[PDB]
Amino acid sequence: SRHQFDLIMCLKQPGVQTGLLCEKCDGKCPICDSYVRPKRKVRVCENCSFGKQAKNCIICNLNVGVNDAFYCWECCRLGKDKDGCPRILNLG
Amino acid sequence: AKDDELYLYHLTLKKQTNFVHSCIGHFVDLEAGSKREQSQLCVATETHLELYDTADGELKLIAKFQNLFATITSMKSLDLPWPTFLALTSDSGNLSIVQIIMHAGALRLKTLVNQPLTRTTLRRVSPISYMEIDPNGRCIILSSVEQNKLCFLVDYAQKLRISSPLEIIRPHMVTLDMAVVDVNFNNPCFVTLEIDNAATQLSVHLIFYVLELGLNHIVKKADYLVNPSANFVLSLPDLSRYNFNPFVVIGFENHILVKDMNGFFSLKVEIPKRSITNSRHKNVTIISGIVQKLKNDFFVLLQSNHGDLFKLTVSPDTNDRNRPLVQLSYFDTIQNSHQLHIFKNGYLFALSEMNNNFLFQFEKLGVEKNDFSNVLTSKDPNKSLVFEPSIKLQNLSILSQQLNLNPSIKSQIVSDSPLSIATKHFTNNKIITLTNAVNYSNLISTSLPPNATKLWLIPDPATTGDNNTLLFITFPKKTMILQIDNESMEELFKLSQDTTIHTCLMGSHSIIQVCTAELRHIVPTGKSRYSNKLTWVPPAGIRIVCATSSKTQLIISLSNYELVYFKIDVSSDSLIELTTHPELDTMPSKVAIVQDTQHADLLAIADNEGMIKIMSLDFLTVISLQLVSEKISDMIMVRDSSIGQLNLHVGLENGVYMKFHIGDVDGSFTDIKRRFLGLKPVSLSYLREISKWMSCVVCHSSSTWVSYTWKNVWTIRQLKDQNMLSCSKFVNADVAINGVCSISSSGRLNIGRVSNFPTLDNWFHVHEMLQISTFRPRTILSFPNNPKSILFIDNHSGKKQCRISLQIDGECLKFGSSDHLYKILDDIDCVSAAIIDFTRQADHLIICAGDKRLLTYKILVNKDKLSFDIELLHQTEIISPIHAMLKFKNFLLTAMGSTIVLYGLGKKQLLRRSVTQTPVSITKIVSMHQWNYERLAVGDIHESVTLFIWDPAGNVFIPYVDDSVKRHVTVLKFLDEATVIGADRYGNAWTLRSPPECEKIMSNHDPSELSNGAIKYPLDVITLQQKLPNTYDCKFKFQLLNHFFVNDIITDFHILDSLSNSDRPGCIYMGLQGTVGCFIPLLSKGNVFMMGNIENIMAEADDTFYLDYESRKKNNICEGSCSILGRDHQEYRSYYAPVRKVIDGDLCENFLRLSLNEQEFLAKNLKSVQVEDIIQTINEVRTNYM
Amino acid sequence: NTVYVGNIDPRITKEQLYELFIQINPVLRIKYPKDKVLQAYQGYAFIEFYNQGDAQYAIKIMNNTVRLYDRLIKVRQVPIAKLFIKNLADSIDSDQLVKIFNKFGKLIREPEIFYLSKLKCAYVYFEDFEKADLAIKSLNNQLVANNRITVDYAFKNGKGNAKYGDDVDRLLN
Amino acid sequence: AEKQRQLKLQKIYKQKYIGLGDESTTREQWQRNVRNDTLNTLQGHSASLEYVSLSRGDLSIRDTRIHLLKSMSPGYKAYLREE
Amino acid sequence: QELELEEEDEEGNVMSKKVYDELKKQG
RNA sequence: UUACUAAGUCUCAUGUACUACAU
RNA sequence: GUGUAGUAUCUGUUCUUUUCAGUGUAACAACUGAAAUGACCUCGAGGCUC
Structure with a gap:
């Protein structure tokens, strides 16, 4: 993540699925963790969804998220939107 | 201090014509309640997109879709087990599957799912540029030129569903020519040619892939190494009758192969060759293969680089065994075509990457497989067949052609006022003048006696239900009357001794003629006779100022005091007058009323003071006032049929034209729409056309302006004819639609037909068996002294050869007394050419041969023997190729590779007058341009523009400014002294400006002191010289002024002081891939403030729709909905370098097509004016600025 | 400037x-x-x-x-020729040195008299490496004022290298 | 830890986007990336592809495209030499 | 650490500036 | 008329802030 | 107004095996290995010295 360093990402070709984030993490752009003017919903590779792990918050990787994560307009222009599958594999 | 900050308004007038992609699906069902037919095609060029249908055997524009603002790098239709909607891949990596839908009253393109892939740019890793879809539509596959390949498994449901991508990644294998093999539902299988990126030797190896629906991944199957010479792959559908084992056709250069999946069968069949094999002869190749199967007969069509179209069928070879054979033959060929399709109908659509897309229906279908003579077999793989091409065109029959200029190399701007663009045709080699003016035919004109004024046309009441129609002319002293019938135009009571202010038909079979001194009420009697039932005269006598009328209704205004109101009695023919005084309180200028209906409310009255009033027809009342400029020259009131809006078209003296929305009930004057056209008091007239029926008003001035209103839009326009004195709609039994009778300003009657109208989509008309010219055009030239005389220079593909074809005025010229209209130059090839006049009375032509020789010529115009006579003068050897040259004062200003030579005129050969050695940075000079002989801007291949100044008595050009960054400049011009236009090889359109620190120095100093002598530079400049000698060597730098990205490659810029008399001088450019667009400097500020706000709206508008659609889902449409593609505007248009001051109007134009709900949804983000005034400002640019 | x-x-x-x-x-x-x-x-x-x-x-x-x-x-x-000369006589004046070396070459500066070990030595500045070679050739190991003097190049190690003739030639030019 | 992550992201970005100069990259390795991307864009834009087609004067445009594709591999020079 | 001044015989298109000035002083 | 540059490492002391942790 | 552990930053101070070779460095630095003893000459420098 932008702040916590040891957090590792996925970075695969995103699928049709949309990543979920919990109400606790709601509002953060999964890359920069910004609250401003979100744009496009996150898309994750199928390898990050499958079973129960699909329900996890793509940000904090623990809680079960209801909400969809959106990229901000700064990351959508920086292109990090399309970089790959954001997810946090290690808890940190 | 005034901020320079040039604000340019980009418009695409004509949209990119080189069609790179096509798809065969059936998208929309239109005009038919229930119909399903596979015959239709959608074709895409990068940004621009079009949808054509045939169904008639003749191709048809359906709708030109909104600009996508991206680079479409592949497009393929998909058919799933339904309306067939096309899968579209572009930059941003997004796989965007779009369905063409009918929304509101037009066809709009809706997006279903866009899947993010790679990043936003044109990349090698980007899984685009190679795309194909399973012929059964089960899965779509994208790949990359190098790195990786992704294949989605497409599924349909109540909502479309794209399965997760299936990845295969081969690091060093560069992919080329994706070709997918059809299947029986067994398993999807695609085929590629992988060339290794990192290797010691060149190795091109085909590879097969079978995607396994069971295991859900792509599987490498057979890797077959073939010679490095490989070109392409095509898919052989089955071979089910002969002996899952797919077979592919690998086009090599000089021969063809076909290969098995299991490698059992590899068949080599040598591709035949032409008889002539003119000059340079490549091993050739086949560019495009295609497959077709019917009635157990499947043949494929593969075309060579020469355009030779071939077929293959498979034979079992019953003697040996049942095994495939491969049989080539010969067809009608064609010009080189990028891609080929075939309808379920026998129509074969040939999409040419060269110039024009054209459709066929094949009948002969080609030679039978039985003939051993002309057909080659797989029996003996080593063999050769020579064949002479056939221009007789037996096999294929052209049905429809699509006029397009894909490779527009150069152009000149002819007839500056009607923006006419003179440019060659690449293949056909015909002169193409594409014009902004309305296309106007002229037929059977007749010379009228001199000194004519106005014109009218009224149906002849004498013959009811007959073609006879009375045409009325006017002279100041006399009035002429004429009779009209089909092919019969004849001449004939009434009043011939006085001018006719007005004349019109009343009710049925009655006429009234209003003249200055008195009126006439005329009725038909018999055939050639007419009788006045009543005549009107002022009580004490007066000169009538003006007259207007309706169908059953009439108004005349005398000198000053009162106005006169007439009606006709129903059930009979009579005239009545009211007893009342409409004093009007002033002298009435001119009167206007709707003549379209029998009863027209709200008379429009004008005053000599320059004000306009409305008259309610309770009864009369003045509800509105207009104080406008100069006295009204003429005015007309017209209510259109479609929307029912009543528009008051008010022409003014000095050439200002105006238009007004008129409320029916209130009669208020709102929605002022003005214009300035020519210098002359304008005239107006009313006509009715189609293109749904339609009505326009012709405007007579120094130019001729048809003002017509399309749906929710209107554009005033110049007409192709120079001038028209008076104009009125005409009809003849000889087929007449849009037909018109008019008169030129010379006082000569003429008949004409208007054809094409400059809509938002077209904005032009293009004035131009199989036809291919061996000569491919090179450049285009025009004489400085003659305002427009355009000389063309072409080349030969073959032994080096040239031709020169000069045209002035209507059509070309003869050469001497010879029949030929062109000149042939043997052994002369032209790398670059320019015409020069060394003396004012002599005209020379300049060729630069690839032999590195400078050739001088002399042009002659025979003048009433008129012909062009070219004469070879001198011969001069040149060190460089001379990529760029131009006219300096009295001299030729040419650029060597390194250095700039200025040649004078010597005899027996031309001399070097001066030479200027370039700064070390400049390797070559692509193009260069001058400012008033004092200054130059010199371009490079690698580096950017550098400006020079000519110093007399120093006999040298001194560079005074560098450029900031490296830019590859194809074409370059001057707007001004201090600023420069330039384009890029890569598509950037930029404009640079010298800094004021430099402008002060050069304005305050003489050039002679720059090279040597005392010029005092601020401390910073010198410190930049010793600190950074490489960049600041030229001691100044261009601050970026305007930057823009047009995905085309700009061939020609031209700076026009006015576009169709418009005040703001524009710069118009033609691109190579073909396009013409403009940059309009915006006066004031709030122009660019409102434009900037509208562009900002439309930029994220797709995101605004997505956030609204998101919120409504929170309380209870993808992200790229409104843009249809993932590319942001600022991102796409920024691209190479960020747009600086240029606001892109091509975006704001898309706001016009959106539905009222969407538009009003977007404009709420502004505290500023309403959607209606938005559309006003948007449509203001094409009207007023050009 | x-x-x-x-x-x-x-x-x-x-x-x-x-x-x-x-x-x-x-x-x-x-x-x-x-x-x-x-x-x-x-x-x-x-x-x-x-x-x-x-x-x-x-x-x-x-x-x-x-x-x-x-x-x-x-x-x-x-930037000029410099010759070390050893075992000078006590009766040798600097001006006498000037007179002795003028015949061989023009002096850019005056000689420098110093005592080593008792041992009278001097530095003589010639404008030319070749004229210095003349004063060396004639005056090396010679008896003046009834005293044997040695004439060679002064140390910088000592002058008269190959690059020294090359660059001193140029400084003459 | 942070730099150590930058190493892994160096491996991933290098894998996706192919050539990315890390610290020490040979001029042969990097210039190859230059040539590959330049040719990539010349053939990638139908625009510049149409342009190079005419300026080169080839009989067909796909000859120029597949030429650039072939020109991406180093051995293609010797291949032309062997024709 | 090539200009051509056009002599009168029309062979001086190879002739240098300073050379033709010398033939001005000679003429 | 002076044509513009000095501290570093170690050692043993002084100057001053700070971070977890406990009453 | 305290104690436990620990950190950073000044300043003071001072120059570590004379050399060679390797690593290292942008060059340094730093690190890694070994070790001359004796005689003589001119003004710490120097030796086709033995």
Whole structure:
């Protein structure tokens, strides 16, 4: 993540699925963790969804998220939107 | 201090014509309640997109879709087990599957799912540029030129569903020519040619892939190494009758192969060759293969680089065994075509990457497989067949052609006022003048006696239900009357001794003629006779100022005091007058009323003071006032049929034209729409056309302006004819639609037909068996002294050869007394050419041969023997190729590779007058341009523009400014002294400006002191010289002024002081891939403030729709909905370098097509004016600025 | 190009110098030092003009002209053969050395008499490596004033190398 | 830890986007990336592809495209030499 | 650490500036 | 008229802030 | 107004095996290995010295 360093990402070709984030993490752009003017919903590779792990918050990787994560307009222009599958594999 | 900050308004007038992609699906069902037919095609060029249908055997524009603002790098239709909607891949990596839908009253393109892939740019890793879809539509596959390949498994449901991508990644294998093999539902299988990126030797190896629906991944199957010479792959559908084992056709250069999946069968069949094999002869190749199967007969069509179209069928070879054979033959060929399709109908659509897309229906279908003579077999793989091409065109029959200029190399701007663009045709080699003016035919004109004024046309009441129609002319002293019938135009009571202010038909079979001194009420009697039932005269006598009328209704205004109101009695023919005084309180200028209906409310009255009033027809009342400029020259009131809006078209003296929305009930004057056209008091007239029926008003001035209103839009326009004195709609039994009778300003009657109208989509008309010219055009030239005389220079593909074809005025010229209209130059090839006049009375032509020789010529115009006579003068050897040259004062200003030579005129050969050695940075000079002989801007291949100044008595050009960054400049011009236009090889359109620190120095100093002598530079400049000698060597730098990205490659810029008399001088450019667009400097500020706000709206508008659609889902449409593609505007248009001051109007134009709900949804983000005034400002640019 | 200026009051500042000399010619640069031991101005500056024409002009017109803080302003414009000779006689005067070596070559400077070990030695500066070779050839190991003197190149290790003839030839040129 | 992550992201970005100069990259390795991307864009834009087609004067445009594709591999020079 | 001044015989298109000035002093 | 550059490492002391942790 | 552990930053101070070779460095630095003893000459420098 932008702040916590040891957090590792996925970075695969995103699928049709949309990543979920919990109400606790709601509002953060999964890359920069910004609250401003979100744009496009996150898309994750199928390898990050499958079973129960699909329900996890793509940000904090623990809680079960209801909400969809959106990229901000700064990351959508920086292109990090399309970089790959954001997810946090290690808890940190 | 005034901020320079040039604000340019980009418009695409004509949209990119080189069609790179096509798809065969059936998208929309239109005009038919229930119909399903596979015959239709959608074709895409990068940004621009079009949808054509045939169904008639003749191709048809359906709708030109909104600009996508991206680079479409592949497009393929998909058919799933339904309306067939096309899968579209572009930059941003997004796989965007779009369905063409009918929304509101037009066809709009809706997006279903866009899947993010790679990043936003044109990349090698980007899984685009190679795309194909399973012929059964089960899965779509994208790949990359190098790195990786992704294949989605497409599924349909109540909502479309794209399965997760299936990845295969081969690091060093560069992919080329994706070709997918059809299947029986067994398993999807695609085929590629992988060339290794990192290797010691060149190795091109085909590879097969079978995607396994069971295991859900792509599987490498057979890797077959073939010679490095490989070109392409095509898919052989089955071979089910002969002996899952797919077979592919690998086009090599000089021969063809076909290969098995299991490698059992590899068949080599040598591709035949032409008889002539003119000059340079490549091993050739086949560019495009295609497959077709019917009635157990499947043949494929593969075309060579020469355009030779071939077929293959498979034979079992019953003697040996049942095994495939491969049989080539010969067809009608064609010009080189990028891609080929075939309808379920026998129509074969040939999409040419060269110039024009054209459709066929094949009948002969080609030679039978039985003939051993002309057909080659797989029996003996080593063999050769020579064949002479056939221009007789037996096999294929052209049905429809699509006029397009894909490779527009150069152009000149002819007839500056009607923006006419003179440019060659690449293949056909015909002169193409594409014009902004309305296309106007002229037929059977007749010379009228001199000194004519106005014109009218009224149906002849004498013959009811007959073609006879009375045409009325006017002279100041006399009035002429004429009779009209089909092919019969004849001449004939009434009043011939006085001018006719007005004349019109009343009710049925009655006429009234209003003249200055008195009126006439005329009725038909018999055939050639007419009788006045009543005549009107002022009580004490007066000169009538003006007259207007309706169908059953009439108004005349005398000198000053009162106005006169007439009606006709129903059930009979009579005239009545009211007893009342409409004093009007002033002298009435001119009167206007709707003549379209029998009863027209709200008379429009004008005053000599320059004000306009409305008259309610309770009864009369003045509800509105207009104080406008100069006295009204003429005015007309017209209510259109479609929307029912009543528009008051008010022409003014000095050439200002105006238009007004008129409320029916209130009669208020709102929605002022003005214009300035020519210098002359304008005239107006009313006509009715189609293109749904339609009505326009012709405007007579120094130019001729048809003002017509399309749906929710209107554009005033110049007409192709120079001038028209008076104009009125005409009809003849000889087929007449849009037909018109008019008169030129010379006082000569003429008949004409208007054809094409400059809509938002077209904005032009293009004035131009199989036809291919061996000569491919090179450049285009025009004489400085003659305002427009355009000389063309072409080349030969073959032994080096040239031709020169000069045209002035209507059509070309003869050469001497010879029949030929062109000149042939043997052994002369032209790398670059320019015409020069060394003396004012002599005209020379300049060729630069690839032999590195400078050739001088002399042009002659025979003048009433008129012909062009070219004469070879001198011969001069040149060190460089001379990529760029131009006219300096009295001299030729040419650029060597390194250095700039200025040649004078010597005899027996031309001399070097001066030479200027370039700064070390400049390797070559692509193009260069001058400012008033004092200054130059010199371009490079690698580096950017550098400006020079000519110093007399120093006999040298001194560079005074560098450029900031490296830019590859194809074409370059001057707007001004201090600023420069330039384009890029890569598509950037930029404009640079010298800094004021430099402008002060050069304005305050003489050039002679720059090279040597005392010029005092601020401390910073010198410190930049010793600190950074490489960049600041030229001691100044261009601050970026305007930057823009047009995905085309700009061939020609031209700076026009006015576009169709418009005040703001524009710069118009033609691109190579073909396009013409403009940059309009915006006066004031709030122009660019409102434009900037509208562009900002439309930029994220797709995101605004997505956030609204998101919120409504929170309380209870993808992200790229409104843009249809993932590319942001600022991102796409920024691209190479960020747009600086240029606001892109091509975006704001898309706001016009959106539905009222969407538009009003977007404009709420502004505290500023309403959607209606938005559309006003948007449509203001094409009207007023050009 | 560059001119030295001196006898400047530390109260004279940079803008004051600039405004002063722009009256004379255009000033390309001004280096006006600022002491890191007194935190002020050390009272002399350097003004680099755009050429030695304006430089020399300002030297002529400016020198002994402007009076700043009652103090006058001053303006001023801003490799040879060496032979060591040992065992000289005490009766050998430097001028006598000059006379002895003039016949062989022109002297760029005067000889330098010094005592080693008691041992009278001298350095003789010739304008030419070849004339130095002449004084060496004739005067090496010779008896003057009834004393044997040794003439060779002085150390820098000693002069007379191969690059030394090459570059000394050029400095002669 | 942070730099150590930058190493892994160096491996991933290098894998996706192919050539990315890390610290020490040979001029042969990097210039190859230059040539590959330049040719990539010349053939990638139908625009510049149409342009190079005419300026080169080839009989067909796909000859220029597949030429650039072939020109991406180093051995293609010797391949032309062997024709 | 090539200019051509066009002599009168029309062979001086190879002739240098300074050379043709010398033939001005000679003429 | 002086044409503009000095501290570093170690050692053993002084100057001053700070971070977890406990009453 | 305290104690436990620990950190950073000044400043003072001072120059570590004379050399060679390797690593290392942008060059340094730093690190890694070994070790001359004796005689003579001129003004710490120097030796086709033995």
